[PDB]
């Protein structure tokens, strides 16, 4: 799996709103406040 | 450094107050803590 440029954490959450993969710290950040995310099983 | 989660291998960077224990972000996503107050720690 790729890691986040902002936070260095695993890119395993798909943000439906932004049509992109984000990390758990992205999900906590103001930038994805209230955004629906889907956990990806690491392949 | 913080310990790593036995179940997921991710850093134990969240404290769950209701469960009185440190968890990782993958633990937090489980329905186990679905509605719990978690605190983010740094290191
Ligand atoms: Zn991120
Ligand atoms: Zn988003
Ligand atoms: Zn965990
Ligand atoms: Zn909990």
From Swiss-Prot, chain A:
Assembly description: Can form homodimers and homotrimers. In addition to lower-order dimerization, also exhibits a higher-order multimerization and both low- and high-order multimerizations are essential for its restriction activity. Interacts with MAP3K7/TAK1, TAB2 and TAB3. Interacts with HSPA8/HSC70, PSMC2, PSMC4, PSMC5 and PSMD7. Interacts with SQSTM1. Interacts (via B30.2/SPRY domain) with HSPA1A/B. Interacts with TRIM6 and TRIM34. Interacts with BECN1; GABARAP. Interacts with ULK1 (phosphorylated form), GABARAPL1, GABARAPL2, MAP1LC3A and MAP1LC3C.
Entry binding sites for Zn(2+): 4, 7, 26, 32
Protein name (Swiss-Prot/TrEMBL): Tripartite motif-containing protein 5
Gene: TRIM5
Subcellular location: Cytoplasm; Nucleus
Zinc finger (B box-type): 1-40
Role, per record: Capsid-specific restriction factor that prevents infection from non-host-adapted retroviruses. Blocks viral replication early in the life cycle, after viral entry but before reverse transcription. In addition to acting as a capsid-specific restriction factor, also acts as a pattern recognition receptor that activates innate immune signaling in response to the retroviral capsid lattice.
Family: Belongs to the TRIM/RBCC family.
The record's note on its domains: The B box-type zinc finger domain and the coiled-coil domain contribute to the higher and low order multimerization respectively which is essential for restriction activity. The coiled coil domain is important for higher order multimerization by promoting the initial dimerization. The B30.2/SPRY domain acts as a capsid recognition domain. Polymorphisms in this domain explain the observed species-specific differences among orthologs.
Record PTM: Degraded in a proteasome-independent fashion in the absence of viral infection but in a proteasome-dependent fashion following exposure to restriction sensitive virus. Autoubiquitinated in a RING finger- and UBE2D2-dependent manner. Monoubiquitinated by TRIM21. Deubiquitinated by Yersinia YopJ. Ubiquitination may not lead to proteasomal degradation.
